[PDB]
């Protein structure tokens, strides 16, 4: 299914949630991260087989949320994965902040490492 958050709305949400400087990250980092993870879809979903990724930050069921169907899992954010599939980003924000605090940055997100880190991210934050 699809329920998009537009780019500039997400920018405002993240700025107003103190994401600038969180664990040394930038707003642009998080926008680029979302574009490559979920394509701005709050009910983005990917079932890789061993684990599933949920919501706008593509949070993984092996480590961070419980979906009841992932073998060898731990639930680091102490939430059901279905909490991460809604228009209400509060649970996504809380959990992503924990993930980034534990890693002291954005390396848990493969899209960010592969398509954002060390690049010119001006386009993701201009024009709002
Ligand atoms: C198919 C595909 O590419 N899927 C993508 C998803 O993989 C990706 O979700 C991210 O998945 C990785 C790999 O499982 C995951 O990274 C692991 O995270 C755990 C928990 O932090 C690490 O285990 C910890 O290691 C630390 C030090 O690194 C220890 O101190 C700690 O004690 C260990 N913790 C526990 C609880 O076991 C793993 O080492 C680490 N593995 C790797 C290879 O990095 C990320 O957290 C997942 N990210 C998110 C946001 O959930 C998803 C997002 O990129 O995108 C899919 O496409
Ligand atoms: Cl920025």
Numbering used by the authors: -1 to 126
Source paper text:
Lysins (amidases, lysozymes/muramidases and peptidases) are such specialised bio-molecules. The term lysozyme, or muramidase, is broadly used to describe the enzymes that cleave the β-1,4-glycosidic bond between N-acetylglucosamine (NAG) and N-acetylmuramic acid (NAM) (or vice versa) in the carbohydrate backbone of peptidoglycan, Figure 1. Earlier reports had indicated the extraordinary stability of the digestive lysozyme from Opisthocomus hoazin at low pH, and the corresponding cDNA sequence (Genbank entry AAA73935.1) had been published. In addition, we have determined the crystal structure of the apo enzyme and of complexes with reaction products (chito-oligosaccharides). The structure presented here is the first to be determined for the avian upper-gut subset of GH22 lysozymes, and is, as expected, very similar overall to other C-type lysozymes.
Screening for ligand complexes was carried out with the supposed inactive mutants, E35A and D51A. Co-crystallisations of E35A were set up with chitobiose, chitotriose, chitotetraose, chitopentaose and chitohexaose, and were successful with chitobiose, chitotetraose, and chitohexaose. The resulting electron density clearly confirmed the Glu to Ala mutation. Unfortunately, there is no density in the +1 subsite—a key aim of the experiment had been to observe sugar bound across the point of catalysis between −1 and +1. It is evident that the mutant retains a sufficient level of residual activity to hydrolyse; at the high protein concentrations of a prolonged crystallization, the chitohexaose substrate to a mixture of the two, three and four membered sugars. The binding of the ligand in subsites −4, −3, −2 and −1 is typical for this family. Unfortunately, the “inactive” mutant retained sufficient activity to degrade longer oligosaccharide substrates, and so the complexes did not span the −1 and +1 sites as planned. However, the long active site cleft is accessible to ligand in the crystals, which may prove beneficial in future. Sites +1 and +2 do appear to be accessible in the structure, and binding of non-hydolysable chitohexaose analogues, for example, with sulphur replacing the glycosidic oxygens, might prove successful if such ligands should become available.
